[PDB]
Coordinates of C-alpha atoms in Angstrom, one line a residue:
Chain A
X1 CA 95.0 98.0 132.8
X2 CA 95.9 96.8 129.6
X3 CA 94.4 94.6 126.8
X4 CA 94.5 90.8 127.0
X5 CA 96.3 89.8 123.2
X6 CA 97.1 87.1 120.8
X7 CA 99.0 87.2 117.9
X8 CA 99.8 85.1 115.6
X9 CA 102.6 85.7 113.2
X10 CA 103.4 83.7 110.4
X11 CA 106.4 84.0 107.7
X12 CA 106.9 82.0 104.4
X13 CA 110.1 82.5 102.0
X14 CA 111.2 81.9 98.7
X15 CA 114.2 82.5 96.6
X16 CA 114.6 83.4 92.9
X17 CA 110.8 83.0 92.8
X18 CA 110.8 79.6 94.6
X19 CA 108.6 78.9 97.3
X20 CA 110.8 77.5 100.7
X21 CA 109.0 74.2 102.3
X22 CA 110.0 75.9 106.1
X23 CA 108.2 78.4 107.6
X24 CA 108.3 79.9 110.9
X25 CA 105.1 81.3 113.3
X26 CA 105.1 82.9 116.6
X27 CA 102.6 83.7 119.3
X28 CA 102.1 86.0 121.5
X29 CA 100.0 85.6 125.0
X30 CA 99.2 89.4 126.3
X31 CA 102.8 90.1 124.7
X32 CA 104.7 87.8 125.5
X33 CA 106.8 84.8 123.0
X34 CA 104.4 82.2 124.1
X35 CA 104.9 79.6 120.7
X36 CA 107.7 78.5 118.2
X37 CA 106.0 76.2 115.5
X38 CA 108.6 75.4 112.4
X39 CA 106.9 74.0 109.4
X40 CA 106.8 70.3 112.0
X41 CA 105.6 71.4 115.2
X42 CA 105.3 73.9 117.9
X43 CA 107.7 74.0 121.4
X44 CA 106.6 76.8 124.1
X45 CA 109.3 79.6 124.6
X46 CA 110.4 79.5 128.4
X47 CA 108.5 81.5 131.7
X48 CA 104.9 79.4 131.6
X49 CA 102.2 78.8 134.7
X50 CA 104.9 76.1 135.7
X51 CA 108.7 77.4 135.4
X52 CA 109.9 73.7 134.2
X53 CA 108.9 72.5 131.2
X54 CA 106.9 69.1 131.8
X55 CA 104.1 71.4 131.0
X56 CA 100.9 69.5 129.0
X57 CA 102.6 70.4 125.8
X58 CA 101.2 67.6 123.6
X59 CA 97.9 70.1 123.5
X60 CA 100.5 72.2 121.2
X61 CA 98.8 69.1 118.7
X62 CA 95.7 71.7 118.1
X63 CA 97.9 74.7 117.6
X64 CA 100.7 72.7 115.2
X65 CA 97.4 71.2 113.4
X66 CA 96.0 75.0 112.6
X67 CA 99.8 76.8 111.9
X68 CA 100.7 74.5 109.6
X69 CA 97.2 74.6 107.9
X70 CA 97.5 78.8 107.1
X71 CA 101.1 78.1 107.2
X72 CA 101.1 76.1 103.8
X73 CA 97.9 78.2 102.3
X74 CA 100.5 80.9 102.5
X75 CA 102.7 79.4 100.2
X76 CA 100.0 79.0 97.9
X77 CA 99.6 83.1 98.0
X78 CA 103.3 83.9 97.7
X79 CA 103.0 82.2 95.0
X80 CA 101.0 84.0 93.2
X81 CA 103.0 86.9 94.0
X82 CA 105.4 87.4 91.1
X83 CA 107.9 89.7 91.1
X84 CA 110.9 89.8 89.2
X85 CA 114.2 90.8 92.1
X86 CA 116.1 87.7 92.9
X87 CA 117.5 87.3 96.0
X88 CA 114.9 86.3 99.1
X89 CA 111.4 87.8 99.3
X90 CA 109.1 86.6 103.2
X91 CA 105.5 86.9 102.9
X92 CA 103.9 87.6 106.4
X93 CA 100.4 87.2 107.5
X94 CA 99.7 88.7 111.2
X95 CA 96.2 87.5 112.4
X96 CA 95.4 89.7 116.3
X97 CA 92.9 90.0 118.7
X98 CA 92.6 91.8 122.1
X99 CA 90.5 91.7 125.2
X100 CA 90.2 95.0 126.6
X101 CA 88.3 96.3 129.9
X102 CA 85.0 96.5 129.2
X103 CA 85.3 93.0 127.1
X104 CA 84.7 94.7 124.4
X105 CA 87.0 93.1 121.9
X106 CA 90.0 94.3 118.5
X107 CA 90.9 91.7 115.4
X108 CA 92.8 92.6 112.6
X109 CA 94.5 90.9 109.6
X110 CA 98.2 92.1 108.7
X111 CA 100.2 91.3 105.4
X112 CA 103.6 91.7 105.0
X113 CA 105.9 91.7 101.8
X114 CA 109.4 92.2 102.1
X115 CA 108.9 94.0 105.8
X116 CA 106.4 96.9 104.4
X117 CA 102.9 96.5 105.2
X118 CA 100.6 96.2 102.5
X119 CA 97.1 95.3 103.3
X120 CA 95.3 94.7 106.3
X121 CA 91.9 94.0 107.5
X122 CA 89.9 95.2 110.7
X123 CA 88.0 91.7 111.7
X124 CA 86.1 93.5 113.5
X125 CA 83.9 95.7 110.5
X126 CA 85.4 93.5 108.0
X127 CA 86.5 96.5 106.1
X128 CA 90.1 95.9 103.9
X129 CA 92.6 99.2 104.1
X130 CA 95.2 99.7 102.0
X131 CA 98.3 102.3 101.7
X132 CA 98.9 104.5 99.2
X133 CA 101.9 103.4 97.4
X134 CA 102.1 102.5 93.6
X135 CA 103.8 98.9 94.7
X136 CA 102.1 98.7 97.7
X137 CA 98.4 98.5 96.2
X138 CA 99.5 96.3 93.4
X139 CA 100.0 94.3 95.7
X140 CA 97.1 94.1 97.8
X141 CA 95.2 93.4 94.2
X142 CA 97.2 90.7 93.6
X143 CA 96.6 88.9 97.3
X144 CA 92.8 90.2 97.4
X145 CA 91.7 88.3 94.2
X146 CA 93.6 85.1 94.9
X147 CA 92.2 85.0 98.4
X148 CA 88.6 86.1 96.3
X149 CA 89.2 83.8 93.6
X150 CA 91.7 81.3 94.2
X151 CA 91.5 81.3 97.4
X152 CA 87.1 81.4 97.6
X153 CA 87.4 83.1 100.7
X154 CA 83.5 83.8 101.7
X155 CA 82.2 86.3 103.9
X156 CA 82.1 83.5 106.0
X157 CA 85.3 82.6 106.2
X158 CA 86.1 86.0 107.9
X159 CA 83.4 85.8 110.7
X160 CA 85.5 82.3 111.5
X161 CA 89.0 84.0 111.2
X162 CA 87.6 86.4 114.0
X163 CA 86.1 83.9 116.3
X164 CA 89.2 81.8 115.9
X165 CA 91.2 83.9 117.7
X166 CA 88.9 85.7 120.1
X167 CA 88.9 81.7 121.9
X168 CA 92.0 80.8 121.8
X169 CA 92.5 83.7 124.0
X170 CA 89.6 83.0 126.4
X171 CA 91.1 79.4 125.8
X172 CA 94.1 80.5 127.0
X173 CA 93.0 83.2 129.8
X174 CA 90.7 80.6 131.5
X175 CA 93.3 78.2 131.7
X176 CA 94.9 80.1 133.8
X177 CA 98.1 79.8 131.8
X178 CA 98.1 83.7 131.6
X179 CA 99.6 85.0 135.2
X180 CA 99.6 88.3 134.9
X181 CA 100.3 90.0 138.2
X182 CA 101.2 93.6 139.5
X183 CA 104.6 93.0 141.1
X184 CA 104.7 97.1 143.2
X185 CA 108.1 98.9 143.5
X186 CA 110.7 98.6 145.8
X187 CA 111.5 102.7 146.6
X188 CA 114.7 103.6 147.8
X189 CA 115.8 107.3 148.5
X190 CA 119.7 108.2 148.5
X191 CA 121.5 111.5 148.7
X192 CA 124.9 112.3 146.8
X193 CA 127.3 114.2 149.4
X194 CA 127.7 118.1 149.4
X195 CA 130.0 119.8 146.9
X196 CA 128.7 123.4 148.4
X197 CA 126.6 122.7 151.0
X198 CA 124.3 121.3 148.0
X199 CA 122.8 117.8 147.6
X200 CA 121.9 115.6 144.5
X201 CA 118.0 113.1 146.0
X202 CA 117.3 110.5 144.4
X203 CA 114.8 108.1 144.7
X204 CA 114.4 105.2 142.2
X205 CA 111.6 102.7 142.3
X206 CA 112.4 99.2 140.8
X207 CA 110.8 95.1 140.0
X208 CA 107.8 96.6 139.6
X209 CA 105.0 95.6 136.8
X210 CA 103.1 97.4 134.6
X211 CA 105.2 99.7 133.0
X212 CA 103.2 102.8 133.9
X213 CA 104.5 104.7 136.7
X214 CA 104.7 108.1 137.9
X215 CA 107.5 109.5 140.3
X216 CA 108.4 113.4 141.0
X217 CA 109.4 115.2 144.0
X218 CA 107.7 117.7 146.2
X219 CA 108.9 120.6 148.7
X220 CA 106.5 121.0 151.4
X221 CA 104.3 118.4 149.9
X222 CA 103.8 120.8 145.7
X223 CA 105.7 118.5 142.4
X224 CA 109.1 120.4 141.5
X225 CA 109.0 121.8 138.0
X226 CA 109.8 119.1 135.4
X227 CA 112.8 121.1 134.2
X228 CA 114.2 121.2 137.8
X229 CA 114.6 117.2 138.0
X230 CA 117.1 114.3 136.2
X231 CA 114.9 111.4 134.4
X232 CA 115.7 108.3 134.5
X233 CA 114.2 106.0 131.3
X234 CA 112.2 103.4 132.3
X235 CA 114.4 100.0 132.1
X236 CA 114.0 96.6 131.9
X237 CA 115.1 94.5 134.5
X238 CA 115.9 91.0 132.7
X239 CA 113.4 89.0 134.9
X240 CA 110.3 90.5 133.2
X241 CA 109.8 93.9 135.5
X242 CA 111.2 97.5 135.3
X243 CA 113.7 100.2 137.0
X244 CA 113.3 103.7 137.0
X245 CA 114.5 106.9 138.7
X246 CA 114.1 110.9 139.6
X247 CA 116.1 113.2 141.6
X248 CA 116.9 116.6 142.3
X249 CA 119.0 118.8 143.4
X250 CA 118.5 120.8 147.4
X251 CA 120.4 123.4 149.5
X252 CA 121.3 121.0 152.6
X253 CA 119.8 120.9 154.7
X254 CA 116.4 121.7 154.0
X255 CA 116.2 117.7 153.6
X256 CA 112.8 117.2 155.5
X257 CA 111.4 119.8 153.6
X258 CA 112.0 116.9 150.5
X259 CA 109.4 114.0 149.3
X260 CA 109.8 111.6 146.5
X261 CA 105.7 110.8 145.2
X262 CA 105.0 107.8 143.6
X263 CA 101.9 106.3 142.3
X264 CA 101.9 102.5 140.5
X265 CA 98.0 100.4 139.8
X266 CA 96.1 102.0 142.6
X267 CA 98.8 102.4 145.0
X268 CA 100.0 106.5 145.7
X269 CA 103.3 106.1 148.7
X270 CA 105.2 108.9 149.6
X271 CA 108.7 108.9 150.9
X272 CA 111.8 111.3 153.0
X273 CA 114.7 112.1 152.6
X274 CA 116.9 109.2 155.2
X275 CA 118.0 111.5 158.0
Chain B
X14 CA 72.9 53.6 90.8
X15 CA 72.8 53.0 94.5
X16 CA 75.2 51.4 94.6
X17 CA 79.4 52.9 93.9
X18 CA 81.8 51.1 92.0
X19 CA 84.8 48.7 92.7
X20 CA 86.5 49.8 96.0
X21 CA 89.3 49.1 98.2
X22 CA 88.0 48.3 102.0
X23 CA 87.6 51.9 103.3
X24 CA 87.8 53.8 100.8
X25 CA 86.2 56.6 99.7
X26 CA 83.8 56.4 96.8
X27 CA 82.7 59.0 94.0
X28 CA 81.0 57.8 90.5
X29 CA 83.2 54.7 90.2
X30 CA 86.2 56.2 91.3
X31 CA 88.0 55.4 94.7
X32 CA 89.9 57.8 96.3
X33 CA 92.6 57.6 100.2
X34 CA 94.2 60.7 101.7
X35 CA 97.4 60.4 103.6
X36 CA 98.6 62.4 106.6
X37 CA 101.7 60.6 106.5
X38 CA 104.3 63.5 104.8
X39 CA 106.8 61.4 102.1
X40 CA 108.5 63.1 98.9
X41 CA 106.7 62.4 95.6
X42 CA 108.8 59.0 94.6
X43 CA 108.3 57.8 97.8
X44 CA 104.3 59.0 97.7
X45 CA 104.6 57.4 94.1
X46 CA 105.4 53.7 95.7
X47 CA 102.6 54.2 98.6
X48 CA 99.9 54.3 96.4
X49 CA 100.8 51.3 94.1
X50 CA 101.9 49.7 97.5
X51 CA 97.9 49.1 97.1
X52 CA 97.5 48.5 93.6
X53 CA 96.8 52.9 92.2
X54 CA 98.7 55.4 92.1
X55 CA 99.1 59.2 92.3
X56 CA 95.4 61.0 92.1
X57 CA 94.5 61.6 88.2
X58 CA 92.6 64.0 86.8
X59 CA 90.3 63.6 83.7
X60 CA 87.2 65.6 84.4
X61 CA 86.3 68.7 86.0
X62 CA 82.6 67.1 85.8
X63 CA 83.1 63.6 87.0
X64 CA 86.0 64.4 89.7
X65 CA 84.0 66.9 90.8
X66 CA 84.3 67.0 94.8
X67 CA 88.0 67.6 94.6
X68 CA 86.7 71.2 94.8
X69 CA 86.1 70.6 98.2
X70 CA 89.9 69.5 98.4
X71 CA 91.0 71.8 101.9
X72 CA 94.9 72.4 101.2
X73 CA 97.8 70.6 99.1
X74 CA 98.7 67.4 98.5
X75 CA 100.8 64.6 96.2
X76 CA 99.2 64.6 92.5
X77 CA 100.7 62.0 90.1
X78 CA 101.7 64.8 87.7
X79 CA 105.5 64.8 86.0
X80 CA 107.1 66.9 84.2
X81 CA 109.7 65.7 81.3
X82 CA 111.8 68.0 79.8
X83 CA 113.5 66.7 77.2
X84 CA 109.8 67.9 75.9
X85 CA 107.9 70.5 77.8
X86 CA 105.0 69.8 78.5
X87 CA 103.1 68.1 81.9
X88 CA 102.0 64.6 81.7
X89 CA 100.4 62.0 84.0
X90 CA 102.9 59.2 86.4
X91 CA 100.5 56.6 84.1
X92 CA 101.3 57.8 80.1
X93 CA 98.0 60.1 80.1
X94 CA 99.3 64.0 78.7
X95 CA 97.2 66.5 81.1
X96 CA 94.1 67.4 79.1
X97 CA 93.9 70.8 78.1
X98 CA 91.5 72.9 80.4
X99 CA 91.2 71.5 83.4
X100 CA 94.4 72.2 86.1
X101 CA 95.9 75.9 86.2
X102 CA 99.4 74.4 86.9
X103 CA 101.7 77.5 89.2
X104 CA 105.2 77.2 89.8
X105 CA 105.3 77.9 94.0
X106 CA 108.5 75.9 94.2
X107 CA 111.0 75.4 91.4
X108 CA 111.2 70.7 90.3
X109 CA 109.4 69.0 88.6
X110 CA 106.1 67.5 90.2
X111 CA 103.1 69.2 91.1
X112 CA 100.6 69.4 94.1
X113 CA 96.7 69.2 93.7
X114 CA 94.9 72.2 95.4
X115 CA 91.3 73.0 95.3
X116 CA 89.4 74.4 92.4
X117 CA 91.7 72.8 89.9
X118 CA 95.4 74.2 91.0
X119 CA 98.6 72.4 89.8
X120 CA 101.3 73.8 92.1
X121 CA 104.5 72.6 91.2
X122 CA 107.2 71.3 94.3
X123 CA 109.7 70.3 94.4
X124 CA 109.3 66.1 94.0
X125 CA 112.0 65.6 97.1
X126 CA 109.9 68.2 99.4
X127 CA 107.8 65.9 101.9
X128 CA 103.8 66.5 101.8
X129 CA 100.0 65.0 101.7
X130 CA 98.9 62.6 99.2
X131 CA 96.0 61.1 97.4
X132 CA 95.8 57.8 95.7
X133 CA 93.3 56.7 93.3
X134 CA 92.6 54.3 90.7
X135 CA 89.7 54.3 87.8
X136 CA 87.1 52.0 86.7
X137 CA 87.5 49.9 83.8
Chain C
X10 CA 98.2 40.0 100.6
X11 CA 95.3 39.6 98.5
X12 CA 93.9 42.6 97.0
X13 CA 89.5 42.7 98.5
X14 CA 87.5 45.0 95.7
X15 CA 84.1 45.5 97.9
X16 CA 81.1 48.0 97.1
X17 CA 79.7 50.4 99.1
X18 CA 76.1 50.6 100.1
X19 CA 72.8 51.6 99.1
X20 CA 73.2 55.8 98.2
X21 CA 71.7 58.2 96.1
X22 CA 73.0 58.1 92.4
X23 CA 75.4 60.6 92.2
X24 CA 76.6 61.1 96.3
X25 CA 79.9 60.1 98.1
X26 CA 79.7 57.0 99.4
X27 CA 82.1 56.5 102.4
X28 CA 82.6 53.7 105.0
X29 CA 78.6 52.6 104.6
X30 CA 78.1 56.3 104.4
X31 CA 76.4 58.6 101.4
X32 CA 77.3 62.3 101.5
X33 CA 76.8 65.0 99.4
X34 CA 77.9 68.9 99.2
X35 CA 75.0 71.2 98.0
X36 CA 76.8 74.9 96.7
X37 CA 73.4 76.5 97.4
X38 CA 73.7 78.7 100.2
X39 CA 69.8 78.5 102.0
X40 CA 68.4 79.4 105.5
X41 CA 69.0 76.4 107.9
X42 CA 66.3 75.3 108.0
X43 CA 65.9 75.2 104.3
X44 CA 68.2 72.7 104.0
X45 CA 66.8 70.7 107.2
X46 CA 63.7 70.4 104.6
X47 CA 66.2 69.9 101.5
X48 CA 68.1 66.9 102.6
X49 CA 64.1 65.7 104.5
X50 CA 62.9 65.8 101.3
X51 CA 65.5 63.7 100.0
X52 CA 65.2 60.8 102.3
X53 CA 68.5 62.5 104.2
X54 CA 69.3 64.7 106.5
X55 CA 72.1 67.2 107.6
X56 CA 75.5 66.0 108.0
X57 CA 75.4 64.3 111.9
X58 CA 78.9 63.4 113.2
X59 CA 79.1 60.4 115.1
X60 CA 82.7 59.2 115.4
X61 CA 86.1 61.2 114.1
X62 CA 87.3 58.0 112.9
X63 CA 83.9 56.5 110.3
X64 CA 84.2 60.0 109.1
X65 CA 87.3 60.7 108.8
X66 CA 87.1 62.4 105.5
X67 CA 85.3 65.2 106.9
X68 CA 89.3 66.4 107.4
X69 CA 89.4 67.1 105.1
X70 CA 86.8 69.8 103.8
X71 CA 87.3 73.7 103.0
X72 CA 84.7 75.9 103.4
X73 CA 81.6 75.9 106.2
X74 CA 78.1 74.2 105.6
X75 CA 74.7 73.5 107.6
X76 CA 75.1 70.2 109.3
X77 CA 72.0 68.6 111.9
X78 CA 73.1 69.9 115.2
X79 CA 71.1 71.7 117.3
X80 CA 70.1 74.1 120.4
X81 CA 68.4 73.4 123.2
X82 CA 67.2 76.6 125.4
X83 CA 66.5 74.4 128.5
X84 CA 69.9 72.3 129.3
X85 CA 71.7 74.7 126.8
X86 CA 73.1 71.6 125.4
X87 CA 73.0 70.3 121.3
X88 CA 71.2 67.5 120.0
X89 CA 70.7 66.5 116.1
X90 CA 67.9 65.7 114.5
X91 CA 66.6 63.4 116.2
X92 CA 67.0 63.9 120.0
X93 CA 70.9 61.6 119.3
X94 CA 72.9 64.2 121.5
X95 CA 76.4 65.1 120.2
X96 CA 78.9 63.1 121.7
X97 CA 81.7 64.3 124.4
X98 CA 85.1 64.6 121.9
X99 CA 84.0 64.8 118.7
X100 CA 83.7 68.3 117.8
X101 CA 85.3 72.1 119.2
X102 CA 82.3 74.5 119.5
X103 CA 83.4 78.1 117.9
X104 CA 81.3 80.7 119.4
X105 CA 81.1 83.1 115.9
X106 CA 77.2 84.2 115.7
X107 CA 74.8 84.3 118.6
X108 CA 72.7 82.0 116.8
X109 CA 71.0 78.5 117.2
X110 CA 72.3 76.0 114.6
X111 CA 76.0 75.3 113.6
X112 CA 77.9 75.2 110.5
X113 CA 80.5 72.1 109.6
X114 CA 83.9 73.7 109.1
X115 CA 87.6 71.3 108.6
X116 CA 89.1 69.5 111.4
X117 CA 86.1 68.1 113.5
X118 CA 85.0 72.1 114.6
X119 CA 81.8 73.9 114.7
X120 CA 81.0 77.0 114.3
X121 CA 77.1 78.3 115.9
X122 CA 75.8 81.1 113.7
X123 CA 71.8 82.5 112.6
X124 CA 69.6 79.7 111.5
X125 CA 68.4 82.2 109.3
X126 CA 71.5 82.8 107.8
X127 CA 72.1 81.4 103.9
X128 CA 75.0 79.0 103.5
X129 CA 76.4 75.7 101.5
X130 CA 75.0 72.8 103.2
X131 CA 76.2 68.9 103.7
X132 CA 73.4 66.2 103.7
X133 CA 74.0 63.0 104.9
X134 CA 72.2 58.8 105.1
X135 CA 73.0 56.2 106.6
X136 CA 72.6 53.2 104.6
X137 CA 70.4 50.6 105.7

């Protein structure tokens, strides 16, 4: 199964070299919109483990306290980036961590300027990396030097940065706010009418999660060619789950000879064509 | 000495000077006032050696440094003229006031923009 | 209202004094034990946090600095350089490096690190 993750995406803006007061920070938990914080406060985006609104929000003080500090720091960082082009400019600092099945972790820090990545650091190895672009390299050095000389960022700052993200991911999981549950698909097999002794059988699987799923038709138990089948994409429901479908043409009468094989998160089921 | 200079009750005392930090976000003007309210002023920076402790300051705060257009120089809210070789000033937000940041920096901000501030008062 | 200007208690020459507690920041990265000794060699100790209120200045310190928070194998708890157990809602202790010491960080945080790793430190002397 996929790893639990946490992502903070901070963004600061400037107009004609003038760094604006407000900034935004988006927190995503296991790939879901979790928090929205402007210069003032953090607020939860819908669906919790609750489903109403009253949740113990005020603990958003912790994230409010910290995300604002980083917001302010990033403003000083944008200030050191002198650009001679009128208009808007944006600077983003994206911090992300993950927890895989084996409980091993992954974690990084990325900087974006006007939408393009220019610097990043693997917080596991502590090794900076930058795109092979004349322009990106200038930006990179500007920020890396500011973090060294002005910001006064030590070797320990990055050790703590790595820990912070991981401890908060664990704080959210340990609190049960993250309810990643499997939702087995519903399976329905339907047929079209015989337009020359032939019919199109369709196997539809819907409302499932996670995203990964295997669907395919079989003749006498042997899976058909990919070229002889029509595949639907995997579409989000609008409820947090997904639907997809597979189909194939068969000579009317051979019906009970065909079956739809499906495997989704451990379960492998077989579905015949209705009679 | 074993005792730190005359200071308002419960303020931070270092080398005879007194400081205090205020969480309440306010604009320069409204901040300048907050200080005077307690017979003080916005942080004034005169010595890198005497105001040594200023290197430990996290984040940025309102300072008492203003900018006068007519001439084109930065001078303290009292009257004093920023003594060269102290603060490295940086253009952050278009404006006439400046915030203090760790390792003797001064970021320019719009005096109307609320922020936290530091009030200080010297000794004779 | 008047304007009462008082003095701050007995502190080593040019140390910081706040609410009758002395503090000094040493930017000479040193071993935890080397720091303990450094503060003990001045009739002080490594910073001890006992109240977010009495020591609110600690809210605005940047970077990480050694403090008297010591581990205990038997239990697994923490206590200061004098049996003083660590109070409940004072510090958020983040597990940074597997170690038995802790660095103090801004906004009452404690990062666990290797006691044999050099870092800057803070000494604290509680005025008589």
